[PDB]
Enzyme design. Sequence first.
Site, PDB file in Angstrom:
ATOM      1  N   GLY A   1       0.804  -1.205   0.000  1.00 20.31           N
ATOM      2  CA  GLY A   1       0.000   0.000   0.000  1.00 20.31           C
ATOM      3  C   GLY A   1       0.840   1.259   0.000  1.00 20.31           C
ATOM      4  O   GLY A   1       1.903   1.312  -0.621  1.00 20.31           O
TER       5      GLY A   1
ATOM      6  N   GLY B   1       3.600   0.365   2.919  1.00 17.40           N
ATOM      7  CA  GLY B   1       4.358  -0.843   2.677  1.00 17.40           C
ATOM      8  C   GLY B   1       3.462  -2.060   2.615  1.00 17.40           C
ATOM      9  O   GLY B   1       2.375  -2.015   2.040  1.00 17.40           O
TER      10      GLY B   1
ATOM     11  N   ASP C   1      -6.838  13.182   0.955  1.00 19.87           N
ATOM     12  CA  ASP C   1      -6.537  12.060   0.065  1.00 19.87           C
ATOM     13  C   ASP C   1      -7.714  11.101  -0.103  1.00 19.87           C
ATOM     14  O   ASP C   1      -7.535   9.883  -0.163  1.00 19.87           O
ATOM     15  CB  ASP C   1      -5.297  11.300   0.545  1.00 19.87           C
ATOM     16  CG  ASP C   1      -4.673  10.451  -0.550  1.00 19.87           C
ATOM     17  OD1 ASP C   1      -4.700  10.881  -1.725  1.00 19.87           O
ATOM     18  OD2 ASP C   1      -4.159   9.355  -0.238  1.00 19.87           O
TER      19      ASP C   1
END
EC number: 2.7.11.24
Length: 337
Positions: free
Chosen positions: A22, A25, A137
Amino acid sequence: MVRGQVFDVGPRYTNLSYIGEGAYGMVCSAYDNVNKVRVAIKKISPFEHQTYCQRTLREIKILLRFRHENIIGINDIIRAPTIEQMKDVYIVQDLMETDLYKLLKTQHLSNDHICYFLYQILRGLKYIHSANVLHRDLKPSNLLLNTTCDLKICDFGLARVADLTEYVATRWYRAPEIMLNSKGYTKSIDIWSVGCILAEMLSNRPIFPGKHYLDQLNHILGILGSPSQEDLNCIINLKARNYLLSLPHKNKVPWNRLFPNADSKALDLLDKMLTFNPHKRIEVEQALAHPYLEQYYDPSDEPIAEAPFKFDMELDDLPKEKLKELIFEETARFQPG
Ligand SMILES: c1cc2nc(-c3cn[nH]c3)cnc2[nH]1
């Protein structure tokens, strides 16, 4: 001990299963031997980059202080007993079934499902904005679903207090202000993202899929039409603003032409969210109170933050060594003892 990479979470967490890499990590599912249930575990290794350290500390503090049905929590945090030994941090969360990104790849969504998903997104976002926090985001892969259509917002690493050249997976959901590197983005950038998500739910494909930077802007203009000088009222690059204002005039494309089979109320709300001018853009409470969501809207069952969120001392000025100390302090509560 997974994909050649270390994942030391035992003895409590066993039977590791790779889910995917992701933002931070490796992400695995594991069996929690204490709670007798499978959980999701994020591995993060941020301590060499100052920005990753920011992201990590941001994630931990936000998610530990937030409490809401439509926002992922943190169940546990595993790391080494000494700050010297601490290289990796494992964040344990509830295991969800999938995310909206995957869902939209395979499944068509009924009007009622789109309506309900949208409600849950805005309900979560209302709480986030009440805490004076921008998510910054919001995108389909950051919206998780369980087996019973329950939706949770995740990944607050890019979140800031409501008072950027780093790599992101996609810019298809970033407001024009962000794209144009303006200095004054408000809560409205999150609203823009939700609209993009609404449009994708309605058609199973992204509304503004630009190939590169300037192409992203062209896609937006091609649908919404040319922006006026008043729409471009943010502190932006003088040359970039003149460029936009000199582009070939585009007319606004009617929503029902792009979305012929959509609820007309959904499109009216969509039109309110995808406004070029941030100050023209609909706010979260006004979106919730839109007729499209009337069957779910209920301000007596939409929790807000008890107090506006406050990183008491400002964060992005700190050396990575100091951030590591803070991360160590914030995760001490989850250590045996
Ligand atoms: C925290 C992150 C996370 N991610 C998934 C997932 C995303 N795609 N497939 C599973 C499930 N549960 C999760 N809990």
